Each structure stands twice: as structure tokens, then as C-alpha cells.
Amino acid sequence: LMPYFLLTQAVRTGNLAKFNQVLDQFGEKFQADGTYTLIIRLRHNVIKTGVRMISLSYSRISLADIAQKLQLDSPEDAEFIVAKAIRDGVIEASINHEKGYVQSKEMIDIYSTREPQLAFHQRISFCLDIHNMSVKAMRFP
């Protein structure tokens, strides 16, 4: 996990050369585990992960600023990346071809207080299977 730790740091930072070097150093075990194709996929999706984190960080971030932050050095590539993030639906960052506007959040609506209970009311379903297991497992002799 020490190279994995450095991989996590590289994912957060957005740099390329440092983790490419450590993959060339200790990437054989990754190949043995069978994730090296994924390893390269993370190596080139580091920018995607950085875009999500910086989009969660900022309200209206400049496309030039995000390109400088994640080593794109290209306004068009930055616009394409944020386009690709929004179409994937991972983040809510939108595009305004004027300067790169992104909408902010809003106060809580009808379903925003109800989606926890809707996704969590399986508690009684767990209770009923526990009770049914007890019914199965209360042999007296």
C-alpha cells in the first residue's frame, strides 16, 4: 500500500510523471494482480478525478484555471473535459461558452429529506428476515 498511497497522492494532485515512474518501478505486482490495464486507466483518468474534486470545491471555476490546475494547458481540452464530466453525470458542473459558468446548490426540496428514508426503510426487511431465521432456528430438542 505504500506505492498505493503514492498512487492516491498522485490521484489527488493530478501529476503524471511521478506515478508513471513508480509504476515502472513496482508495477509488476499490479500486473500479477491483473489491474495494470486499470492502472493505466487511472493514470489517464487522474484528470477526471481531479476535475470532480475541484468542481465540488469551486462554484464558478474558470476553464483556464482548471486546465492550469490539472496540467491541461488548453482551454478547448478543459471545455471538453467538463463537457465529458457533465455527460457522465458524476458532477453538476455545466458549460457556458462565455466563461464557463457552473450552477450552485439549492435548499432542500420535497424528496431531498425523503431519499434517506426511502433508501433506508429496508430496516424492517432486515428485521423480518432476522425473525424468520429465528423461527427456523428455535428447535426445542
**Which residue ranges make up the site for another protein (CB under 8 A)?**
12, 53-54, 57-62, 65, 99-101, 104-105, 107-110, 112-114, 116-117, 120-121, 123-124, 126-127, 130-131, 133-134, 137-139
C-beta of 30 vs 55, nearer to another protein: 55
Residue 3 Cβ, how far from another protein at the closest point, in Å?
A: 21
Distance (Å, whole) CA 99 – CA 82: 13
C-beta of 1 vs 107, nearer to another protein: 107
Cell for 109? 426540496
Distance (Å, whole) CA 15 – CA 119: 38
Residue 116 Cβ, how far from another protein at the closest point, in Å?
A: 5
Burial classification of residue 95, based on how many CB atoms lie within 10 Å of its CB (0-12 exposed, 13-18 middle, 19 or more buried): middle
